[PDB]
């Protein structure tokens, strides 16, 4: 109920002064307003890192001073136990001790006996601390254009990126979450450079009248410390026109892009208060764009601060989802980074649950309810793939309190009490399970009741906010798991604690061997199918659910399930669907019109198997039907789910030409976009199975024929084929799958080759108003998917043929586009990115030799992120297959040394996804000194951020996980 944390707190004041751009430092004094809890509260602890304190003071009494950093290495630097398990446990205990959620110490000012007798008298104090941030080496950012003479004035900006509890790394506070306070914030700014934080513009004129300005932001609304952040330098645009108080801040010469970008935001606020039945529970909303991100999402109080990649300025169609997509997260988590708030790290999951689910609800009623369902399927893709890579993603209420473990999910690392142990794979899947468990709460409970719950939540919170600080009666904004659950059951008490102990408290994905049987195959037994499952490693047994079956033209048959899963079950039987030449359509689903006796229709009154098409249980369903039923489901079904899963099932085995026919038929209607993209890849696989069975044509050329008439298109489709965004994605996708079409003589896509080169010829002028950009990019990736591994039979790597022949043509085109985007550049060098992937795939077939120095020259500093990020993916696979020790050393040195966080994040992420030096396959000899430097980088050089050494934990997970590395 209450915090086990003493010394309640009310108010705090910051005052940044003397912010430097040359030695690049910040000075400031903080004051704190504390009601202590018990006497002898002497060694008062706050916490920070990378903070040289200048002085401490309580009421003109500089009291004592304790300053440790056990967030640094092991107490002995050569603790030879250099494996995972000891380090994980030791680091877990270490940073748990760093947390003040116990009697601890990082900043323990000791109360003097004078002030202790005052505590005996009055437990009300003020705390004044002078301190100075240095060059911030893991807490802040000073984005500086490398000019330093004049453009250091106009061209730089300054802010704070960081994770959840990175307020420590900025200015000293508590365990930064779950301490309800209010703030007055004093900001020493340039008169031009505008600084934006939480709260309100409460006191600012041309301030202090000397040379600069100084801002007062007061947040009266009672929040916690991990919401506070200050972006200094941009330009103001109120992008108000519909809702009058919506505030935006961007770097100069980026401004009118916001004029396209920012809008649709009003519609989102309209949506959110259609949900919540409040107002936007604040004064205003503030948004900062920045060339960097520790995290792309980042969302704080009244303010979302995130990257300048999401502008999508009016012509750049493919960020039509993405921009407002991410804007949705930067509102929803906003509210639950506002008000609802975790009582512990082990209490959060409801927060990200309801936040992500709410913007899922947004994605329903904004665009693509079928793309909504598609998004859910990708969620299951991420979750199933990760918890079959790894162990579970569990949502504890449970501690290992008393030095206990209780962690089967310690397949790598700690989770229970701590954010800063986890992987981004883990933290991402945490959010993904959060979405889907809220969908299960839909599955047991009305959406209207969800509105009821959330309105009660925010009513109690906004009531408990904005007052005189009701003393001892204020922490109702900690709305964590237990009382939330209680409020759910107060709205409707159902058996949702089984829902918890299934999904919240048994992190297991469930496959399904629901084995198809066929009764009423003129069978005495009638319409029966068996239930089956067992598959450990990561299994889970979920029993009582139901089953969704479509008849021929009839009932959605739904059938119960049980535990003790060696089961056989029936179907609520269809009629005697006989004389079905006469029973043409006895009402399939509404007025749908279909006739085929093409299936095994002597005695097949069935059409389709399903378990829970609304995707209730975390599933990976394995079964078998007649292939007719799969293909006919692809003739039509009312689920994108069903359509792409029959897409996968028919990507496995078959090749009739009727399959090809029904595929193409599916591609030419109004059905769905991405359905057709995976249908293209169906044609790719099945026409690759057409080597001896080349029965159909050179495929899909006819699809560009019969679907595309510019001016009836006399044999070639060229021009202006946009504004119909079905066709946009479809033309963007199809030639890639055409470049896959290969039959084994030399895999010979020669017609397709020359055809795609012709596609690259016939590109449009400014008649297309839509910046003919990504179309180029995926035509280039089709050329990258012209993978020709087997030209160099003996030695042909080395300028020998000026290697030949069509490879050279592909080289001509990619050389052209690289120099065009060096000259034109169109939008993020996205073309250049696809080019770099293409050039690496050319090295992976030995045509341009395996040399990294190009990619090395695109991993450099002064390029874009995305260029640099793709070069790093490339050189990671280079060091994977080729055995370059030296560039690996370079890579790790740059993991140490570069200013950008997000490259370090993605280096370590896809380094771990795509490893060299793979465990117990050690030919390139990590044991020599590489384990040593890696152990160092786990210990040293990585106190900048948590997640960098979390990635290093992932490195030692993959590379030599649960053991000595076979050194000594």
């Amino acid at each position: 109920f209450e915090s086990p944390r003493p010394y309640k707190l009310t108010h705090q004041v910051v005052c940044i002064n003397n912010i430097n751009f040359q030695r690049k430092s910040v000075v400031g004094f903080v004051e704190l307003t504390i009601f202590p809890t018990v006497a002898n509260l002497n060694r008062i602890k706050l916490n920070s890192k990378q903070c040289r304190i200048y002085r401490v003071r309580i009421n003109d009494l500089e009291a004592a001073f304790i300053y440790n950093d056990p967030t640094l290495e092991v107490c002995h630097s050569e603790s030879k136990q250099r494996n995972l398990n000891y380090f994980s446990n030791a680091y877990a205990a270490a940073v748990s001790a760093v947390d003040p959620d116990a009697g601890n110490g990082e900043l323990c000012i000791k109360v003097p006996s004078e002030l202790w007798k005052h505590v005996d008298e009055l437990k009300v104090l003020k705390i004044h601390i002078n301190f100075s941030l240095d060059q911030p080496k893991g807490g802040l950012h000073f984005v500086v254009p490398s000019v330093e003479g004049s453009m250091a004035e106009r061209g730089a900006h300054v802010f704070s990126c960081g994770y959840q509890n990175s307020t420590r790394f900025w200015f000293p506070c508590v365990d930064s979450y779950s301490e309800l306070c209010t703030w007055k914030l004093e900001f020493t700014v340039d008169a031009a450079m505008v600084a934006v934080s939480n709260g309100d513009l409460v006191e600012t004129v041309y301030t202090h009248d000397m040379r600069k300005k100084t801002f007062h932001y007061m947040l009266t609304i009672p929040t916690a410390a991990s919401n506070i952040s200050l972006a200094i330098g941009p330009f103001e645009i109120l992008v108000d026109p519909y809702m009058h108080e919506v505030t935006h801040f961007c770097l100069p010469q980026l401004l009118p892009l916001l004029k396209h970008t920012t809008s649709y935001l009003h519609e989102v606020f309209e949506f959110y208060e259609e949900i919540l039945t409040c107002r936007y529970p604040y004064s205003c909303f503030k948004t900062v764009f920045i060339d960097e991100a520790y995290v792309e999402v980042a969302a704080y109080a009244s303010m979302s601060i995130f990257s300048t990649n999401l502008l999508h300025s009016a012509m750049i169609i493919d960020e039509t989802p993405l921009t407002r997509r991410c804007l949705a997260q930067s509102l929803a988590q906003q509210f639950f980074g506002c008000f609802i708030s975790r009582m512990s790290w082990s209490d959060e999951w409801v927060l990200k649950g309801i936040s992500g689910y709410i913007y899922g609800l947004w994605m329903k009623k904004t665009f693509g309810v079928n793309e909504y369902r598609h998004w859910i399927k990708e969620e299951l893709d991420k979750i199933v793939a990760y918890e079959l890579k790894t162990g579970g993603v569990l949502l504890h209420p449970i501690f290992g309190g008393g030095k206990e473990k209780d962690n089967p999910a310690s397949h790598l690392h700690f989770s229970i009490k701590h954010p800063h142990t986890l992987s981004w794979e883990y933290y991402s899947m945490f959010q993904c399970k959060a979405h889907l468990v809220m969908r299960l709460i839909e599955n047991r409970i009305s959406m209207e009741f969800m509105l009821q719950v959330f309105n009660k939540l925010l009513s109690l919170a906004s009531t408990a906010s904005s007052q005189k600080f009701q003393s001892h009666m204020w922490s109702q904004m900690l709305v964590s798991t237990s009382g939330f659950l209680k409020s759910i059951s107060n709205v409707s008490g159902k058996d949702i604690q089984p829902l918890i102990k299934q999904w919240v408290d048994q992190s297991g994905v469930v496959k399904f061997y629901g084995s198809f049987a066929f009764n009423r195959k003129r069978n005495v037994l009638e319409l029966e199918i068996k239930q089956d499952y067992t598959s450990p490693g990561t299994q889970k047994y979920v029993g009582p659910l139901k089953v969704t079956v479509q008849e021929l033209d009839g009932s959605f048959n739904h059938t119960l399930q049980i535990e003790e899963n060696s089961l056989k079950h029936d179907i609520p039987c269809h009629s005697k669907s006989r004389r079905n030449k006469k029973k043409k359509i006895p009402l399939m689903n509404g007025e749908e019109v279909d006739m085929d006796l093409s299936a095994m229709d002597a005695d097949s009154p069935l059409l389709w198997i399903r378990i829970d098409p609304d995707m209730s249980v975390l599933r990976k369903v394995e079964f078998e039907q007649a292939d007719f039923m799969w293909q006919y489901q692809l003739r039509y079904e009312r689920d994108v789910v069903a359509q792409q899963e029959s897409i996968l099932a028919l990507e496995k085995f078959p090749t009739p030409a009727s399959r090809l026919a029904l595929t193409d038929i599916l591609e030419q209607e109004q059905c769905f976009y991405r359905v057709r993209m995976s249908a293209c890849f169906c044609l790719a696989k099945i026409a690759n199975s057409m080597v001896s069975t080349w029965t159909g044509p050179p495929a899909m050329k006819s699809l560009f024929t019969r679907m595309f008439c510019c001016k009836s298109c006399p044999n070639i489709v060229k021009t202006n084929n946009f504004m119909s965004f079905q066709s946009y994605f479809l033309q963007k996708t199809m030639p890639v799958a055409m470049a896959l079409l290969r039959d084994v003589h030399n895999l010979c896509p020669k017609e397709v080759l020359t055809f795609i080169l012709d596609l690259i010829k016939y590109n449009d002028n400014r008649k297309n108003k839509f910046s003919d950009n990504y179309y180029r990019a995926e035509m280039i990736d089709a050329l990258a998917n012209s993978v020709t591994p087997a030209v160099s039979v003996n030695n042909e790597v080395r300028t020998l043929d000026n290697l030949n022949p069509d490879v050279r043509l592909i080289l001509e085109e990619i050389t052209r586009f690289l120099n065009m985007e060096k000259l034109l550049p169109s939008y993020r060098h996205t073309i250049t990115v696809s080019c770099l992937r293409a050039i690496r795939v050319l090295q992976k077939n030995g045509h341009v030799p395996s040399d990294p120095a190009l990619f090395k020259s695109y991993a450099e500093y002064g390029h874009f992120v995305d260029i640099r990020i793709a070069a790093l993916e490339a050189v990671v696979d280079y060091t994977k297959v080729d055995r370059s020790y030296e560039e690996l050393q370079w890579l790790l040195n740059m993991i140490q040394n570069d200013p950008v966080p997000y490259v370090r994040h993605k280096i370590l992420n896809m380094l771990t996804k795509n490893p060299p030096f793979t465990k117990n396959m050690e030919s390139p000899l990590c044991n020599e000194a590489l384990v040593d430097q890696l152990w160092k980088l786990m210990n040293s050089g990585t106190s900048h951020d948590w997640r960098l050494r979390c990635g290093a934990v992932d490195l030692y997970f993959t590379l030599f996980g649960l053991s000595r590395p076979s050194c000594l």
């Binding site: 254009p145 770097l251 980026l254 939008y827 993020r828 450099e860 874009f864």
Partner: peptide, 22 residues
């Protein structure tokens, strides 16, 4: 220098004002 002389990298100071400019 004959067949494929790709331009090397510039890298310059401010990438975003360039790559995000219609």
């Amino acid at each position: 220098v004959s067949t494929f002389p790709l331009i090397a990298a510039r890298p310059f100071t401010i990438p975003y004002l360039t790559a995000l400019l219609p």
